[PDB]
Amino acid sequence: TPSQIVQGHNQVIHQYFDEKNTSGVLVIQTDKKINLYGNALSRANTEYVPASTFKMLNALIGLENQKTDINEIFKWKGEKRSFTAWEKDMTLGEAMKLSAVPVYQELARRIGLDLMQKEVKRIGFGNAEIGQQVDNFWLVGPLKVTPIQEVEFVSQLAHTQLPFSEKVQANVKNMLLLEESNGYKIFGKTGWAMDIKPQVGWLTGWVEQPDGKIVAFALNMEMRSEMPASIRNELLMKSLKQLNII
Numbered sequence: 001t002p003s004q005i006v007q008g009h010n011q012v013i014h015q016y017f018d019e020k021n022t023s024g025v026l027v028i029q030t031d032k033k034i035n036l037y038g039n040a041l042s043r044a045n046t047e048y049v050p051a052s053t054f055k056m057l058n059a060l061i062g063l064e065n066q067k068t069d070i071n072e073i074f075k076w077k078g079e080k081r082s083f084t085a086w087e088k089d090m091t092l093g094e095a096m097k098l099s100a101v102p103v104y105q106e107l108a109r110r111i112g113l114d115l116m117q118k119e120v121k122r123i124g125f126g127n128a129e130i131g132q133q134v135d136n137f138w139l140v141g142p143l144k145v146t147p148i149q150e151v152e153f154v155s156q157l158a159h160t161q162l163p164f165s166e167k168v169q170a171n172v173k174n175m176l177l178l179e180e181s182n183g184y185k186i187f188g189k190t191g192w193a194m195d196i197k198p199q200v201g202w203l204t205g206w207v208e209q210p211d212g213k214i215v216a217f218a219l220n221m222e223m224r225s226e227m228p229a230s231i232r233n234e235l236l237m238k239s240l241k242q243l244n245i246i
C-alpha cells in the first residue's frame with residue numbers, strides 16, 4: 001500500500017504562492033480571530049507601503065471632512081493618464097473601482113497636508129506618517145502599514161466601527177463592492193506599488209456570507225513587473241474557496 005499526501009488548506013495556500021515564484025501572505029479575520037496563510041507568514045507583521053489600498057482611507061477622510069460627496073463628478077482635465085480607461089469624468093466610487101490615482105490625488109490635495117496628517121494620526125493607520133508630499137505618500141512612502149493592520153482596519157470598516165460617521169462608512173463600503181452571487185458579496189481594494197523595490201501587491205477587503213457573517217481578508221505579496229495584475233485576484237479567490245469562505 002502506497003503513502004498518500006494529505007493536502008490541507010494550509011499546505012495548499014502555501015503552495016499557491018510557491019507556484020507563482022513569489023512570497024505572499026493571506027490574513028483572515030472573523031469573529032475577532034485572525035489566521036495566517038501563505039508561504040511567507042513573516043509578511044503579516046511587516047510594514048509595507050499601502051499603495052492604492054489607501055484610497056479607502058482617503059475617501060473616508062474626504063467625505064467626513066466634506067471635501068467631496070459621493071455624487072461629485074471629478075473632471076478629466078486633459079492630461080495623458082496611465083490608462084485610457086481613466087480618461088473620462090468619474091465619481092469617487094468609479095475611481096475606486098478603476099484605482100484612478102489622479103482622482104484621489106485631487107482629493108488628497110483638497111484635504112491638504114495638515115488635515116491629512118491629523119486624520120491619519122487620529123485613525124492610527126500603520127505608522128501614521130505621511131511626510132511632506134501630499135500626492136504620493138501612500139505610493140512611495142513614508143506611510144507604511146502591516147497586513148494585520150490592514151485586516152483590522154477593513155474589518156472595522158465592514159462593521160461600521162471606524163471613528164467616522166456611519167453614513168460615510170456606509171458610502172465607502174458601497175464603493176468597494178466587487179462581486180455578488182448566490183447570496184455572497186465580496187468587497188475589496190487592490191494595490192500595487194510599482195515604483196519601489198521590492199514591489200508590493202495588495203488585495204484587502206471582506207466577504208459577506210449569505211447569513212450576514214463578515215470574513216475580512218488582506219492579501220499581501222511581492223510583485224514583479226511581468227505579473228498580470230489579476231494574479232492578486234486569482235490567488236485570493238482560490239484561497240477563499242479552499243478555506244470554504246466562499
Ligand SMILES: *C(=O)[C@H]([C@@H](C)O)[C@@]1(C)CC(S[C@@H]2CN[C@H](C(=O)N(C)C)C2)=C(C(=O)O)N1
Nearest residue numbers: 051052083097098099101190191192193229
Ligand atoms: C495603486 O496602488 C497603484 C498606483 C499607481 O497608485 C495602481 C493604480 C496601479 C495598479 S495596477 C493597474 C492600474 N489600474 C488597472 C486596473 O485594474 N484598472 C481597472 C484600470 C491595473 C493598481 C491596482 O492594484 O489595480 N493600483
